[PDB]
Amino acid sequence: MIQGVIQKIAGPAVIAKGMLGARMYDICKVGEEGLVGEIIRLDGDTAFVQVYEDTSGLKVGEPVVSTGLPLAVELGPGMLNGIYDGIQRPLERIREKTGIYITRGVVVHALDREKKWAWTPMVKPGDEVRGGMVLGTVPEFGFTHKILVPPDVRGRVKEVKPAGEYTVEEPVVVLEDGTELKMYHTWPVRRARPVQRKLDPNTPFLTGMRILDVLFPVAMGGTAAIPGPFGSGKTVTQQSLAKWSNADVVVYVGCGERGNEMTDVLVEFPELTDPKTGGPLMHRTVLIANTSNMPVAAREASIYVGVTIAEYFRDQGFSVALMADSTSRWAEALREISSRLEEMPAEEGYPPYLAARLAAFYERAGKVITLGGEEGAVTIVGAVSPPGGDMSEPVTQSTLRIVGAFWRLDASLAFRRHFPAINWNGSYSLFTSALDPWYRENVAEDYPELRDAISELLQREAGLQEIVQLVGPDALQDAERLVIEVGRIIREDFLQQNAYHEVDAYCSMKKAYGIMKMILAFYKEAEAAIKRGVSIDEILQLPVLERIGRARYVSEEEFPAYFEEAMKEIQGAFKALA
Amino acid sequence: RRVNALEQVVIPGIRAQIRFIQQVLEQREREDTFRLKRIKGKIEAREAEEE
Amino acid sequence: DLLKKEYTGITYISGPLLFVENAKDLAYGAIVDIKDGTGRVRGGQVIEVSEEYAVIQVFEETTGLDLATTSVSLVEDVARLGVSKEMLGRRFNGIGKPIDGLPPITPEKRLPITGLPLNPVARRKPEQFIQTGISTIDVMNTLVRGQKLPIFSGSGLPANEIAAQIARQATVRPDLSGEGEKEEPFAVVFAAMGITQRELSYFIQEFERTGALSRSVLFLNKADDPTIERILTPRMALTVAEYLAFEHDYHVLVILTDMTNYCEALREIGAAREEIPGRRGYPGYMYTDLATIYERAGVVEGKKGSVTQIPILSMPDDDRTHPIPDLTGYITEGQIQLSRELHRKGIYPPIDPLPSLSRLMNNGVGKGKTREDHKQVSDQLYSAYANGVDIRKLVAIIGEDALTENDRRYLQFADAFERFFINQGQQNRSIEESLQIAWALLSMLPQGELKRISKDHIGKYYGQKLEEIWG
Amino acid sequence: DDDRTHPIPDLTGYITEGQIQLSRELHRKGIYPPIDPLPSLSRLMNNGVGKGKTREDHKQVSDQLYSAYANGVDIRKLVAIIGEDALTENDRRYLQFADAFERFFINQGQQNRSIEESLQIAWALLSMLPQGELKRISKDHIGKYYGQKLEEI
Ligand SMILES: Nc1ncnc2c1ncn2[C@@H]1O[C@H](COP(=O)(O)OP(=O)(O)OP(=O)(O)O)[C@@H](O)[C@H]1O
Ligand SMILES: [Mg+2]
User: Fold this and answer.
1) Composition of chain B by helix, strand, coil, percent to 5
2) CB within 8 Å: C63 and A25
3) For tag attachment on chain D, is the N or C end more exposed, with fewer CB atoms within 10 Å?
4) Under an 8 A CB cutoff, do B8 and D80 touch?
5) Count H helices, E strands: chain C?
6) Are A88 and A25 in contact (CB under 8 A)?
7) Nearest-CB residue to A41 (from C14, C396, C399)
8) How far is B31 from chain D (nearest CA, A)?
9) Closest by alpha carbon to C359, among C394, C384, C326, C332?
10) Taking the CB of residue C210, how many other CB atoms lie within 10 A of it?
11) Distance (Å, rounded) from C-alpha A279 to C-alpha A273?
């Protein structure tokens, strides 16, 4: 291999001379310790290497060895129920080897080479195999893991291992040209995995939140962005999505965030229940952790590793949801790397190619037809952290041009403890018109009409709030007072949701439909009562208002009995007066 | 009522916008000063140090 | 010649640039082949040549390149594209290669993609008015055949749907202009730069539903495609459009999906070459670069063909003073600006009439072309809408209960205008229907206040009721 | 300045787990310490309160105090532009609660109040409102802690 020596050290940047023949974006071993590095610039006899670990203590003259391969991850059984480093290293072995502190130079295999896996063959000798075909099955925590041909391999089957227990590195299928296929394969993280076709998303991604499932839906295979200042509620929303969504596999990427938030997932999740399989919740979740005090250059690799794992699980027919904690930290890492290269900066010091990377990252999502023939989808939700809440910053503006949903948070609502604090006036969703055929047969035929009525009521309340604060509430007529009060009722009882309450944390679609029906029925009855001369104070002091407010705390099993009685209660209460 | 509204609403709203615009212009001036430094460094190198 | 010399001796690879030392024989602007050690061939273009070394920009990514095995060979001195009449109905990528599985085009001619400036003596005035079926465009911002009319959009605004509706409903009116002869359908040239799958699927389905693929040529450059390839796509699209229009008398309509992506691609090369920046880091030659794209449309004296452009671009923070819309507005002949406030109220299409402008409106309207009362009605509508918008800001401060009757009339006229004229849905209104609605809305105002309209037209058209049109 | 968006407190906010903000308005009128409960936040509070540590009624009392103080601040700031002509009896009760709250609970001075006497003062302030207004508290904790008088007079 190509071997050289260090001739310049400056921060996370190492320049190695004598590296003629090295290729762009390859993986190198830097120094006598063996730090992992990547080549990003070639200049004559020297090469420019960025280092994914701490460079303190290195001396000029240490050897540099190039592996001749780009950055790749090991894809196979054993990735579920695991916590990984930014360059795909299991942290539970790092703790065993080094203790409570993370130290550089530790080399650990990504997949366990000692665990035995039950093997059930599917192919036979003499068969013809192509990329993405299934040649066997391996059991997992309720899932059936499929061993897939690598996408760039073609040939004919020569022999098949019989049924039994083997490790991941034992060959199971040998091709007629001499190629030996194991239970795992390696794939470069910077290359998108091939697919046959892409399909239009037409099924909803149920998040469990009322305001996101009703007002601003996101389809299976779409993309969404959630910006907001600190303390707005991005992490709580992402963790609630991880807990309560209907996706088969959830991949969580923590890029440059707190370590306590990652420890919370490691502690709480093994004791929870999977919404659809009935097992432990951690059995379907993969964690990639790179905290803020960890080396900066590993932030870029973690996003690619997570999206590559999500693409790999997509090819098996599963439905994968990918959550990124913050892309602003990735932008900061790119800015630091470009500053070490002394390149010309764009606005706010970011490199000019920042938008291309974000476009190439969000493009990997979508519902596809796999090479094997199954159907899978990947949905990406990425949180953005503008500095002062200024959403004119380049990262937010580059993100808004490719995403299909925009969940804008407000610092004004977060200070008054109104959650999830979604600014319903600035938010939008482009997937609403495509999910209406699904809603019309899976929930109710009149669901879009009720949603439009609720939106119109919110718009009218927002319009009247200017007159309310510029003339005073006393100058308003009773008809406008009714609209103001109904808007307040809607805001307090439907949009607001508690993520820590034992019942209110999850809400089905039919429960939200029933709440909307109750609110609209109350509004219609109160509107009818106004023409009959009933005072607005008599309407507001009715005890049926508390029944609507307490409706969101009712469990799913008891809710239909609550709704059936509450409708008659509303009708009788408005019948008994005047 | 009009005096109270003008005193407590409009004036801080204008003042914050003024401060924001001043900060943006200051940042732009610093960013162009950095580019001028870089191009002066480039000019000083190729005209004296090269053979 | 039939053979080419391979230039070994690459000494610098970083970003999109590549340096070669022994390349004094390469012409400026030539296209080269970059051969990887594994046999893969990538494209490139020379941007600076000297007796010491040459500078080459790379279209594809630089992954896998090394300084030992990579070699550079010349393709041609001038970048050329083979064009033919048989390429209608085909699909190509951003560099002119087929992606539909059909065999490549047999070229009738090869033309330089950089183009040549049109002689101002050889031009002629655009005269034929185009009925797009939208009242806010037909009446107030009239589009003529041969005009450049970009659409100013935002992040969530539906510019693509408006462009598709315009391309679906565009037709000229020979009966009004007295020509008589039935027009041929427009030939559509579609160029996409950094488009996503969500918009591309919508465009493909809309074109397949209307059967326009038999008359369309598509150049597609997706978001996952290399960024540097976006430089050549508009030039190839415009070369094909100009060839079809001025060699075979076609009427060509050209749609560009996002010029913001083209500017972002240009900024990378500008920053890599250490050029003097503009106001927000964009290169100082961006005005000249954009001018070579827009100015290729128009009409030619003594020829039947025409080129019409409808570019689409997104203002980042809904900002009209951003460098890209600012430089676009100085080159084109108008703009159509969408409004987010109208979009939030359910109005479709959300075209804002006041920021919109059509510079070539006066050529295609008047007696003998559409009607004698077009321009005066348009001006009166503009003035009345401006008065209503100004009165809204007054009632936002003093309250609506202190208004006079005239201010209340203007305030009601503004709401009626927004609810009836702008908001039309998917229907295809003719010019006569739009003028009827415009005269119905003007009837709400007192007759004496119509200062900009002559009394001869007032005595003929005033007095229409709106309830006879909408119930 | 009042600039919450200055880079230093902004970058401090993205790393830490909450903040305690001092108010200049409370400092001007003599309240010590001038801690403003509305922009303050503690993200890890939910793990450290409950049964077995402190007292089992900590979270309910905290939520009720926050709700009542927020209502009192809303009532107080409604008057400052339009006038005091729209107050009802309940609004005056919440205004009196806010006044006594800023007088006693926040304005503790250089004392060394324990958690037990702090909860005692909090319950003494909660006794100024009717039991029907205390929506956030379960009625079990009301039955065994309601009825305290103002101890700091
Ligand atoms: N849906 C919710 N229900 C209840 N409380 C919530 C909700 N969302 C946020 N909170 C509260 O607000 C706090 C916000 O913390 P969170 O980690 O969600 O913020 P963030 O937007 O990720 O900020 P940061 O940028 O500082 O990481 C939570 O710790 C919790 O106390
Ligand atoms: Mg967070």
Assistant:
1) 90, 0, 10
2) yes
3) N
4) yes
5) 13, 20
6) no
7) C14
8) 17
9) C332
10) 11
11) 6
**A164: β partners:** A119
DSSP assignment letter at A166: E
Report how far apart the first and last C-alpha atoms of chain C are (Å, whole number): 75
Q: How many CB atoms lie within 10 A of CB D138?
A: 11
In chain A, where the domains are located: 1-71, 72-114+182-429, 115-181, 430-577
Secondary structure (DSSP) of C137-164? HHTTS--BTT-B--EEE-SSS-HHHHHH
Nearest to C192 by CA among C164, C243, C230, C228: C230
- The C-alpha atoms of residue C196 and residue A360 are separated, in whole angstroms, by 10
Among candidates A41, A70, A355 on the partner chain, residue whose Cβ is nearest the Cβ of C264: A355
Task: Find out whether C157 and C340 touch, Cβ atoms under 8 Å.
Answer: yes
Q: How far is A258 from chain D (nearest CA, A)?
A: 7
The SS3 assignment for D144 reads helix
Going by DSSP bridges, is the β-strand pair A223-227/A375-384 parallel, antiparallel, or unpaired?
parallel
Tokens representing D56?
């089992």
Q: Which residues surround ligand 2, an ion (CB under 5 A)?
A: A 234-235
Q: Identify the three-state secondary structure at position B20.
A: helix
Tokens of A166: 């083997």
| Structural tokens at position A195 | 């697919």
Distance CA C103, CA A280 (A): 55
Say how far apart CA A377 and CA A366 lie, in whole Å: 6
Structure tokens at D37: 């409960």
Closest by CA position to C41, among listed C83, C97, C84 = C97
- Please indicate if any CB of chain C lies within 8 Å of the CB of B2: no
Residues 6+ apart with CB under 8 A from C70: C10, C34, C35, C36, C37
Q: Which residues pair with A118 in a beta bridge?
A: A165
Rounded to whole angstroms, the Cα distance separating C407 from C124 reads 46
Q: Please count the other Cβ atoms lying within 10 Å of the Cβ belonging to residue C425.
A: 8
Nearest CA in chain A to C345: A459
Q: Please tell me if the CB atom of residue A25 comes closer than 6 angstroms to any atom of ligand 1.
A: no
Please check whether residue D42 is in contact with residue D58, taking contact to mean a CB–CB distance below 8 angstroms: no
Tell me the DSSP string of chain B. -HHHHIIIIIHHHHHHHHHHHHHHHHHHHHHHHHHHHHHHHHHHHHTTS--
C267 vs A352: CA distance, rounded Å: 7
Place of tokens 């700031």: D77
Task: For residue D6, give the nearest of B14, A388, A232 by alpha carbon.
Answer: A388
> Which segments of A are annotated as binding site for ATP?
228-235
d(CA A312, CA A289): 19
Q: Per the CB < 8 Å rule, is B39 touching C274?
A: yes
How does DSSP classify residue C105? P
Burial class (CB in 10 A: 0-12, 13-18, 19+), C283: buried
Q: Are C218 and C91 in contact (CB under 8 A)?
A: yes
Q: What was the structure determination method?
A: cryo-EM
